[PDB]
Amino acid sequence: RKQVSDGVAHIHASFNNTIVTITDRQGNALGWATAGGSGFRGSRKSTPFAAQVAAERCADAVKEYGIKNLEVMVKGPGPGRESTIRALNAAGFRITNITDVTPIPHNGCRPPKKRRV
RNA sequence: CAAGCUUGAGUCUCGUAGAGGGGGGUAGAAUUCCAGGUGUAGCGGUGAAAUGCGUAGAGAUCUGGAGGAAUACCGGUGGCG
């Protein structure tokens, strides 16, 4: 029901999960996939493979809007930075930018206790 | 006890470095919450789970606002006390 042309892949790479979210150039979200959505719990949720499928499962969900190009913003540490920025290429978009937008405090807020494990 | 001396101890002159102390302003990043827009089924968490949050629209994403605390990089068997 629409055109957009130019979008923005926001990949959010926690340790437990990845969320890819494709959005247009001014913030408004079109589609999203998670690792947990793609049939993966627990150990397998995390992995760089189930980051991939996340990408696809999302590049599938924006045939409708008929995107050609996107920028990739990457927010976080985890596995599926490197994998997910490759599975948006090979599922048939052009990649203009790749950004790292990971929050670093300029010493700010006290984190939680060390784990004893 | 008296009289000295200048090397110990001090005073003055001029400079240099410094997270030394006390009071007053101010900057940017981040977390949390609040009010919106886009959006849809999960999120979060773990060794693996559940309790927990979510179709009363969460998480993701963008805009605006509040507030408190701490000051990335510099940063160093560097420095001051």
UniProtKB/Swiss-Prot annotation:
Q: Which domain of life is it from?
A: Bacteria
| Record Gene3D superfamilies | Ribosomal protein S11
GO BP annotation list: cytoplasmic translation; translation
Query: What GO CC terms are in its UniProt record?
Result: cytoplasm; cytosol; cytosolic small ribosomal subunit
Q: Which InterPro entries match?
A: Ribosomal_uS11, Ribosomal_uS11_bac-type, Ribosomal_uS11_CS, Ribosomal_uS11_sf
Which GO molecular function annotation, any one, does this entry have? small ribosomal subunit rRNA binding
The entry's keywords: Methylation, Ribonucleoprotein, Ribosomal protein, RNA-binding, rRNA-binding
PROSITE patterns assigned:
RIBOSOMAL_S11
Per UniProt, subunit arrangement is: Part of the 30S ribosomal subunit. Interacts with proteins uS7 and bS18. Cross-links to IF-3. In stalled ribosomes contacts ribosome rescue factor SmrB.
Question: What does the record give as the function of this protein?
Answer: Located on the platform of the 30S subunit, it bridges several disparate RNA helices of the 16S rRNA. Forms part of the Shine-Dalgarno cleft in the 70S ribosome.
User: NCBIfam families this protein is in?
Assistant: PRK05309.1, uS11_bact
Q: What else is known?
A: Has been predicted to contact the N-terminal domain of IF-3 based on footprint studies; exactly how IF-3 interacts with the 30S subunit is controversial.
Similarity comment: Belongs to the universal ribosomal protein uS11 family.
Q: By its UniProt entry, which HAMAP family does this protein fall under?
A: Ribosomal_uS11
- What name does UniProt use for this protein? Small ribosomal subunit protein uS11
Q: Which organism is it from?
A: Escherichia coli (strain K12)
What gene, per UniProt, encodes this protein? rpsK
